[PDB]
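dumping the sequnces here before i forget
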Amino acid sequence: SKPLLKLKLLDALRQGSFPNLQDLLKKQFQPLDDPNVQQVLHLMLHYAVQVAPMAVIKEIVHHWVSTTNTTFLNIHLDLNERDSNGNTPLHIAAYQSRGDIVAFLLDQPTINDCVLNNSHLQAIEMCKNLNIAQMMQVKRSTYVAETAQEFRTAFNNRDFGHLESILSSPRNAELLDINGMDPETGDTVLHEFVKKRDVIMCRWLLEHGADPFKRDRKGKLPIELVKIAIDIELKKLLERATREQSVIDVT
Amino acid sequence: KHYNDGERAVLQFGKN
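..and the predicted 3d for all of it:
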């Protein structure tokens, strides 16, 4: 069908019945394997934020986005999929100053608001209304705040599973430093946990960034905070870890 | 004290 597939879909969203949208994809997007269907199908979220009413977006999201609940036509929508122009549905939503939608997108769990398009622009830069930018900028502030507290809590409880959950989220990888000092202490998380001689947690930290060369505010880098067979386990652990970093510096 | 407990964690694990 080539591009009238885009018209079929851009029309189905424009009406506003999520059943009616399914009924179109069910009988008009066959065969689902041919790549012209799968390409215009995976633009569905960019198309919803332009022409579809609000409730159709929620119904599209809460059904097919970042979910393994077998869905419908085995359709799985990536919330941060990228245009031919590199944009995400959050980009278009912002660009068109459709603010009530920029809100609902930033409240989703897998939203990545730090994606760069082809022009090398964040989704926040596309809008024209400052009122929309401010709410966008405010929401990043609240997310980084709430997530940084979940990070601290996860370390204090030694919730290993929750830590791998937070560093996996790419939006977090962009807005979260595993090194940063505690403001009124030394103190990277490596120092804090070398001092509790917690070998299992230090090994975990060494694998997820956490460089062993960062001093605290007393010059002491981690290795210099050292039965006693637990001590020599850390001391040999860091020795092996620093030797890996000094292989990139070939000269 | 200076910083509370959560805004303490924003300075530590936040990236500006």
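Chain B touches chain A at residues 2-3, 6-15 (CB under 8 Å).
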